[PDB]
Amino acid sequence: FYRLKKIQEKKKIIKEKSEKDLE
Amino acid sequence: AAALGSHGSCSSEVEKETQEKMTILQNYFEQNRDEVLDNLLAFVCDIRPEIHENYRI
Amino acid sequence: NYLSQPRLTYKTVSGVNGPLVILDHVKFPRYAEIVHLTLPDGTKRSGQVLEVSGSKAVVQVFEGTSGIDAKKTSCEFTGDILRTPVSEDMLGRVFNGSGKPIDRGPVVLAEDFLDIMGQPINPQCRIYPEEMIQTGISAIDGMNSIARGQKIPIFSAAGLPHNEIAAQICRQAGLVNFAIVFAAMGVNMETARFFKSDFEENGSMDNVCLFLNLANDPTIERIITPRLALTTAEFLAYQCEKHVLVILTDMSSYAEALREVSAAREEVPGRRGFPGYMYTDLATIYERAGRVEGRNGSITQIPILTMPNDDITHPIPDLTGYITEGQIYVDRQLHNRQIYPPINVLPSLSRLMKSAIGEGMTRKDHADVSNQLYACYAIGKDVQAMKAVVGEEALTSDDLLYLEFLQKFEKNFITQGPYENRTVYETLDIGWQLLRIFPKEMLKRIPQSTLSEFYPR
Amino acid sequence: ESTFGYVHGVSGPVVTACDMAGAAMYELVRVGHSELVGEIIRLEGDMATIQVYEETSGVSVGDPVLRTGKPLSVELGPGIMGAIFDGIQRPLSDISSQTQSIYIPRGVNVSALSRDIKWEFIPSKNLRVGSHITGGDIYGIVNENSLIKHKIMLPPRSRGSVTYIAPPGNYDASDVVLELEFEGVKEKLSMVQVWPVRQVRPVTEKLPANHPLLTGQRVLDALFPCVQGGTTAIPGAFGCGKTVISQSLSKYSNSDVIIYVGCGERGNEMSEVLRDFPELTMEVDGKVESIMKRTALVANTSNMPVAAREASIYTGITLSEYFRDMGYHVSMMADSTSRWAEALREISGRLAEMPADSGYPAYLGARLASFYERAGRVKCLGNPEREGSVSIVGAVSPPGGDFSDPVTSATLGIVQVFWGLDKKLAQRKHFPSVNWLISYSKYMRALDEYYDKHFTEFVPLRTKAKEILQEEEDLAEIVQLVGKASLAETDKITLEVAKLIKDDFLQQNGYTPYDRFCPFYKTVGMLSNMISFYDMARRAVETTAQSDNKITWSIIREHMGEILYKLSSMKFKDPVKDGEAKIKADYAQLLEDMQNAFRSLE
Amino acid sequence: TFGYVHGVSGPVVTACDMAGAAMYELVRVGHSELVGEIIRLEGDMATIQVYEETSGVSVGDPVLRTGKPLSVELGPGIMGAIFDGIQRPLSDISSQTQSIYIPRGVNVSALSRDIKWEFIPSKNLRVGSHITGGDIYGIVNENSLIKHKIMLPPRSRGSVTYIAPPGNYDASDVVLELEFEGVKEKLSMVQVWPVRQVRPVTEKLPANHPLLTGQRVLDALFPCVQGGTTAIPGAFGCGKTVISQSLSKYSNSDVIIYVGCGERGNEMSEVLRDFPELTMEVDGKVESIMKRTALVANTSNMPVAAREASIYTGITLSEYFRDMGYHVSMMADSTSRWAEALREISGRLAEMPADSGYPAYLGARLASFYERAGRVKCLGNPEREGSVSIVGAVSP
Amino acid sequence: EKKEKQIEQQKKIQMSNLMNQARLKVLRARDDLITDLLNEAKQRLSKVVKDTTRYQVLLDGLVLQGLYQLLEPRMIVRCRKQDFPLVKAAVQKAIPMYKIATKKDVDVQIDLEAYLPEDIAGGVEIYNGDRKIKVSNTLESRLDLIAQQMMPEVRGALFGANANRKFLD
Ligand SMILES: Nc1ncnc2c1ncn2[C@@H]1O[C@H](COP(=O)(O)OP(=O)(O)O)[C@@H](O)[C@H]1O
């Protein structure tokens, strides 16, 4: 559970950064 | 009855001691009140405007 | 001297997430500073900045985050860490889990503003604790002696009378002036009344202080509840040279507040989901027990913890186990037989007992009497475990004597009234009258000189 | 560039900092206006992520972050032996003296060694102007303590030709004792050198380990021997005696110097060592002296900042390697290894590196491996030939007393000696609580070559001891289900002699005059008598069970009750008062008493 | 007032223009006004854990925030009602909708409007008089048993400016008006209270008078006390019904609140069939125990937060009858199924699991629940004692 | 005998309660005296603000002190109507001293649209140009902030030093 919550957090951060880089 | 008489006696004693303590408080207070009052009034008036220690440029 | 610079107040809440409020635009956030929060309805709250990054500050709120609002909430930054106002006048008083008074008295007029965290005591200055406290209870003063400046917890199964034992130590403990500090985390109302009433009945009010966080109070206050007690104990002991017994009730409810914060922050888990740092957090509490060089004072701790499902391998007892100078333990095997105080000696030990035991502190034999009582009681448990399978027909006569020793031992050594006070010397005379159950040559832990002087008495 | 960056953020021990472009990973940096010591652990651009070896409460964004270009390092030199240092190598005696307070102030700038004390320096007397000199060459002796001579040596990286060497005299840490020229460049040296803690001090060769590490304790000495230069762990639950073993090695062993490392340990423990060790005395050349003169303490107690535990371990081994290069048999007590793995866990949690097992970082196995592999016997660097060693003894402390814990699991993949401490023995107050089935020593083959030079009987006795205990543990799986009734007489002898060995050989009461330490001669003697009893008692039954006049285990117990009492009494012999000859003579009387009693049963 | 739905992922709805909203504020989302709570704020955006099924909610649907957090309406009409876990009255829902279903996004007020109960004002009050939280400003005779004390909310205080005369009035009619600091508050018989917040009291007292169940085994061997907290192992073969029915028919408890915290569909209907049919003797009359009780009821398929909140609604209701001077008994029938609904919230919130997958705070959620029991000196003028007992069934 | 024990226990509890009441009366009396010393400090400040000379010196300080805590490019200063003439001059003096010490320009505006309550003794509150962040330089706020931190000196001066406090660890 903990490992997978961290993976999902890293993906959320990478999604946000990828959107911010298009602005 | 002996317990009730002891309670009344102790009530008188702790009241007397309370009034003594309150008297000592009022005495020492009034003896120092003006000096402390002038100290707080000095430090609240001495502003010393300063930037925060981490400011840059 | 004092911080003269005026405080900033921010409305710049940029998020709220579980127990955390995330301020932004903050000018130079100070890590672990306190923030006073005012809610939309005018309710005052408090918090600590548990992370900082550039313009942001992640304040954890002590009273929880219900009713925090992202436009109206005002956060006043104090510019400094959490300080406890401390003074001698904190004796005879009751405070809540955040050090606010609840005895209907005034605010604490401070002699100083000590840091809630304290500071690490310098190992060079830490005087070794060796002067013996008698608690009055044979199962403690005999086989689990307590030094002035020791930390030693009571471990309990759920529902056991550990509160009555902790009360009895505060009722009857002393040397061969002991002020008291008491903290409780997540304590039920009836137990809060029990401790408060016990101190009032024993009359020892002018030299005790209480910090109470009840089971209905906010859980995050439990992080600072024992630290307030210790910060008061450090003032009384190290600045006023008093001796203090610090009681930490329900360290399990404390550890659950850490488990809650850990889970709510996504902190890296250790065993059972407690935070990976739980050992250090417990150490920052427990290690403030001790004597120190050139000061006559001493902080002694008796923490109390109920073990979840009575499991000794649970992180709460287990990490406490590593940090403290041995354990006092209480057990259903005694309590279910009405053996108050239900202190099982075998899982119990005191790491500082060996240094406290000896001449002038105690009778010279005391170390040896203890060593043999443990051996006889241990064999007694092992022969009981055998008998339950095979009956007396497969036990030896000597094994049946250790089974009889176990019965005589619990009924005389451990069994003791809630107001019955025993010195160590009477406890050792009882210990010898139990050890006399075997022939002299069987007492294989004791030297022949000690046997020759004391065995026939 | 700026010589300092600025704090960008804080989270427990971790501090991120801006304007840290041009910083090395593992560079030491000072954080906050108070100069909290820390070390760079990750780089993210112009930002550096720092691990701070002091409590970060009160650090502010925009506080200074001073670079140094140097990794975390130890000043090595005179003033170590008999001193005590915090986890970042600051001496606590000076901190008390300068501060007059019971607390370590955060951001203390004290030098790691006293620069004002004068030391007696004897130069090597073979060196001259123009002598060629290399790393690890001894350029003099300092009379630091009556027991320990500090063989000051050229830093291992340095090389050169002697240009100045100081005459005999009294000098301090600032006095240039040696000056070298090499390749048109000069180097000036005092009696102190700076070495990076994360860097292994090199050696001429890592030699085979073939000499026992003699200790205070019977079962450690005999049944699971450690070797000088060996790697050892003591996995054990709380209250099991991991600390009593660690001090037993420290107080009573054949090591020339001891480095004791209170990594994450309760504070009363470092105080216990500091109080007890100056009173306790060893003897050299018929002169009694305080064991503190051969001990060096690294303190970093359970309530000090977790990051300083990693710094404490690496400091303690760096010190240990220095004394090894002086040609000493060094011993290092690592008083807790899981407390270091917890520091690595918390930091890795702030870095958000994926956890491996129990939340520990995946590099824990490499951290422990690269720590334990700094142990060994070695041929030292530099001109005069020396042999020395570091023995490392890691007090692994698995949560819940379960040896499957990742710190234990990773440790036992590396170390060559396992003294597993069993909570069930500790509960029964059987100390040392070492479980003899679980425990192992891999150095036994390497030590049999030594035992044959002094005690040819020992390898037979050690073998027979394990046979007695193994047969008893296997018989116990029956006894637990059927009771003490169905056993043969040989099996009852095995059971009762294994209980004699448990109670009177494996147990040792380390808080008493007779069991405080147990010299190796008492160890072989006690074991020889108990195994002699076993062999004779076995032969008596096995010979007579073939006939009507059968001897029984009860007949042996009843007829030889005084012998069983005498065998049990053997522990109480006092090594200070009962001389070695007297103990051997008393044990020979027991041998003859047995032989006469068995001859009376025959 | 209105925000707009920004996005939806399963039962979680993100909203925007929510800048004035609060953590745990209760919000209606979608045109059908699905219930949910704010679990996070992120600027002008809020994340709402919706309780009800979110199927059909659209980006740009209205988000009407209720100013208060999750709360219980308190007043006359509580007696005899079958509330659900969020105080939607199932009787009003049935009567108004004429349907066997609960329709998604009910708006029915918890206390029925237009029922003009007989009200008597407190005879001691006058225009200008001082008043404080817990003061009785009148009584509503809703049932022959429960003279329902109407009393000032615990935060409110000041000088009385109007009281209604004796007459017929409902939950929405203004009964009291008072001024404090120059500001006037108008109050009705309805009161609203945050369900997770303890109602404050003059002193939480020790529990010392027996709560008789009328059963020899209980009252003799293992007594319980008014204000006390007790538990029962609830299972099929346990016989819990014998305790439960006997407590409601015979206990020396002036009000009973029963809470179905996620009972099975059929097992809930067995309970809701019995409690109307149960009768009690009072003053030599026979009357339905529904004159002295209220049922919170939730089947296992009710919204997760309706199950999780149902225990807290029961004790919020019970504290309100405690504050009237009544010796309240609360029965909770399935504390295991409540802890499952609690666990489901943590699983949707992705909070880290503790022991056996339950949340870290389970100990505190239970402990702060049972600590809401006890005898008390109530707030306000008549000095009255009152109490809440809690029976908490558990299913090992 | 059990009833006599209960009478004796009640006697002990009553004696404890009498001592508790006495201790609490003494504590309340100390805090009341300290409170009235702080009230006298508020009274003395209420006299000081009547002198436009000393009060302009305070306002020149307090405005600049606020500017140095907020550090923004745009700010708003709130005062009472009575303060306004002095505060406008204080802002006009402070902008130079601010720009000198911080190098950068600032646009500071006196808040003639939204004065402070007249019951405040004096001083100023400074806000960002968006009103989202503030700093309190009112004489009451600065007094309470200093007087609270000075509480140990105040206690030690008004009631004398506690003879038990032999160390400062
Ligand atoms: N070898 C020993 N001989 C005698 N007693 C011992 C020995 N080892 C441990 N003990 C006893 O058990 C206690 C626990 O040992 P200790 O070193 O304090 O445990 P820990 O493993 O936690 O460090 C000691 O304080 C002492 O009372």
Q: With helix as H, strand as E and coil as C, how does chain E read?
A: CEEEEEEEECCEEEEECCCCCECCEEEEECCCCEEEEEEEECCCCEEEEECCCCCCCCCCCEEEEEEEECEEEECCCCCCCEECCCCCEHHHHHHHHCCCCCCCCCCCCCCCCCCCEEEEECCCCCCCCEECCCCEEEEECCCCCCCEEEECCCCCCEEEEEECCCEEECCCCEEEEEEECCEEEEEECCEEEECCCCCCCCEEECCCCECCCCCHHHHHHCCCECCCEEEEECCHHHCHHHHHHHHHHHCCCCEEEEECCCECHHHHHHHHHHHHHCEEEECCEEEEHHHCEEEECCECCCCHHHHHHHHHHHHHHHHHHHHCCCEEEEEECCHHHHHHHHHHHHHHCCCCECHHHCECCHHHHHHHHHCCCEEEECCCCCCCEEEEEEEEEECC
Cis peptide before F85 (omega within 30 of 0): no
Which 3 state secondary structure label does DSSP give F15? helix
Task: Report CA(C351)–ligand 1 centroid distance (Å).
Answer: 7
| Dihedral angle over CA of D148, D149, D152, D153, nearest 10 | -90
Contact C367, C373 (CB under 8 A): no
E strand residue ranges, D291-375:
295-300, 329-334, 355-357, 360-361
Q: What angle do CA D402, D408, D410 make, to 5 degrees?
A: 140
Task: Report CA(D301)–ligand 1 centroid distance (Å).
Answer: 19
Q: Which atom of ligand 1 sits closest to the CA of residue C352? A: 25
Q: Would the CB atoms of B41 and F62 count as touching at under 8 Å?
A: no
Distance CA C194, CA C430 (A): 32
Nearest CA to ligand 1 atom 5: D509
Cβ-proximal residues to C54 (8 Å cutoff; 6+ apart), any chain: D8, D9, D61
* Residue C299 lies in domain: 2-457
Residue D281 C-beta-side C-alpha neighbours within 13 Å: 9
Contact C328, C143 (CB under 8 A): no
**Per-domain residue ranges of chain E:** 1-70, 71-114+188-396, 115-187
Which 3 state secondary structure label does DSSP give D231? strand
Contact E351, E359 (CB under 8 A): yes
Q: Would the CB atoms of B54 and C5 count as touching at under 8 Å?
A: no
Task: Report CA(C379)–ligand 1 centroid distance (Å).
Answer: 20
Nearest CA to ligand 1 atom 7: D431
Q: Which residues of D36-54 are buried (b: 16+ CB within 10 A; e: fewer)?
A: bbbbbbbeeeebbbbbbbb
Distance CA D541, CA D492 (A): 11
Task: List the CATH code of the domain at D73-116+190-441.
Answer: 3.40.50.300
Residue closest to C195 by CA, chosen among C146, C247, C237, C155: C247
Q: Would the CB atoms of C269 and A5 count as touching at under 8 Å?
A: no
Q: CB-based contact (8 Å) between B32 and chain F?
A: yes
Residue D21: how many other CB atoms lie within 10 Å? 13
Task: Report CA(D239)–ligand 1 centroid distance (Å).
Answer: 7
Encoded tokens for B3? 């317990």
Q: Would the CB atoms of A5 and C268 count as touching at under 8 Å?
A: no
Nearest CA to ligand 1 atom 18: C351
Helix axes D364-372, D338-351, angle to 10 degrees: 140
Distance CA B16, CA B11 (A): 9
- For residue D87, the chain C residues in CB contact (below 8 A) are none
How far the first Cα of chain B sits from its last, in Å, is: 82
Specify the number of domains making up chain C. 1
Q: Would the CB atoms of A5 and E353 count as touching at under 8 Å?
A: no
Which 3 state secondary structure label does DSSP give C148? coil
Distance CA D325, CA D379 (A): 8
Q: CA E68 from chain center: how many Å?
A: 15
Residue closest to C145 by CA, chosen among C345, C420, C316: C345
Which 3 state secondary structure label does DSSP give C154? strand
| Residue to mutate, D431, D503, D508, ligand 1, most ligand atoms under 8 Å from C-beta | D431
Cis peptide before C341 (omega within 30 of 0): yes
For D133-193, give the secondary structure using H, E and C: EECCCEEEEECCCCCCCEEEECCCCCEEEEEEECCCEEECCCCCCEEEEECCEEEEECCCE
Q: CA E128 from chain center: how many Å?
A: 33
Q: Which atom of ligand 1 sits closest to the CA of residue D421? A: 21
**Mode of pairing for the β-strands spanning C298-306 and C154-156:** parallel
Which 3 state secondary structure label does DSSP give C447? coil
Contact E54, E27 (CB under 8 A): no
Q: Is the dihedral of CA C104, C105, C109, C110 positive or negative?
A: negative
Which 3 state secondary structure label does DSSP give C247? strand
Q: CB-based contact (8 Å) between C103 and chain F?
A: yes
Q: What is the DSSP letter of C29?
A: P
| Dihedral angle over CA of D503, D505, D510, D511, nearest 10 | 50
Q: Which residue type occupies E343?
A: R
Which 3 state secondary structure label does DSSP give C433? helix
Q: Which residue type occupies A10?
A: K
Cβ-proximal residues to E250 (8 Å cutoff; 6+ apart), any chain: E212, E213, E214, E280
Nearest CA to ligand 1 atom 25: C351
Q: Would the CB atoms of D6 and B53 count as touching at under 8 Å?
A: no
CATH class in words for D117-189: mainly beta
* DSSP string of C287-354, one letter each residue: TT-EE-TT---EEEEEEEEEPGGG-TTSHHHHHHHHHSSEEEEE-HHHHTTT-SS-B-TTT-EETTHH
The strand pairing partners of D142, in sequence order, are: D121, D150
Cβ-proximal residues to C355 (8 Å cutoff; 6+ apart), any chain: C128, C129, C130, C147, D272
The strand pairing partners of C23, in sequence order, are: C13, C57
Distance CA E173, CA E189 (A): 7
Cα nearest neighbour of C262 on chain A: A2
Residue D142 C-beta-side C-alpha neighbours within 13 Å: 23
Q: Which fold has domain F42-156?
A: hypothetical protein PF0899 fold (3.30.2320)
Which 3 state secondary structure label does DSSP give D588? helix
Q: Which fold has domain E71-114+188-396?
A: Rossmann fold (3.40.50)
Q: Which fold has domain E115-187?
A: OB fold (Dihydrolipoamide Acetyltransferase, E2P) (2.40.50)
| Domain at C130, CATH number | 3.40.50.12240
Nearest CA to ligand 1 atom 9: D241
Residue count of chain E:
396
Q: Which helix (H) or strand (E) holds B43?
A: helix B2-45
Task: Report CA(D568)–ligand 1 centroid distance (Å).
Answer: 22
Q: Would the CB atoms of B49 and F97 count as touching at under 8 Å?
A: yes
Mutate: best of C239, C288, C291, partner F, most F CBs <10 A? C239
Distance CA B34, CA D233 (A): 69
Q: Would the CB atoms of B52 and C4 count as touching at under 8 Å?
A: no
Q: Which residues of F87-110 are buried (b: 16+ CB within 10 A; e: fewer)?
A: bbebbeebbeebeeeeeeebebeb
E strand residue ranges, F66-166:
74-78, 107-110, 123-128, 133-138
Contact E57, E5 (CB under 8 A): yes
Distance CA C28, CA C456 (A): 76
Place of tokens 């294989």: C444
| Dihedral angle over CA of C61, C62, C65, C68, nearest 10 | -60
Residue closest to A7 by CA, chosen among E48, E360, C266, E345: C266
Interface B-D, measured as beta-carbon pairs within 8 A, has a size of 10
Q: How far is CA C454 from CA C145, C450, E348, F149, in A?
A: 21, 6, 69, 63
Distance CA C117, CA C224 (A): 9
Q: Is the CB of D572 under 6 A from ligand 1?
A: no
Residue D407: how many other CB atoms lie within 10 Å? 30
Q: What is the DSSP letter of A15?
A: H
Residue A5 to chain D, least CA–CA distance (Å):
11
Contact F38, F141 (CB under 8 A): no
Cβ-proximal residues to C2 (8 Å cutoff; 6+ apart), any chain: B43, F146, F149, F150
Encoded tokens for C36? 């006073």
Q: Is C417 exposed, middle or buried (0-12, 13-18, 19+ CB in 10 A)?
A: exposed
Encoded tokens for D510? 């380390």
Task: Report CA(D267)–ligand 1 centroid distance (Å).
Answer: 16
Place of tokens 């809060």: C192
Interface of E with C (CB under 8 A): 18-25, 40-44, 46, 69, 194, 196-198, 204, 206-207, 351-355, 359-361, 363-364, 367-368, 370-372, 374
Residue F112 to chain D, least CA–CA distance (Å):
35
Q: What is the DSSP letter of C440?
A: G
The strand pairing partners of C83, in sequence order, are: C115
Q: How far is CA E282 from CA C21, C51, C153, C352, E330, in A?
A: 54, 62, 54, 67, 20
Q: Which atom of ligand 1 sits closest to the CA of residue D237? A: 21
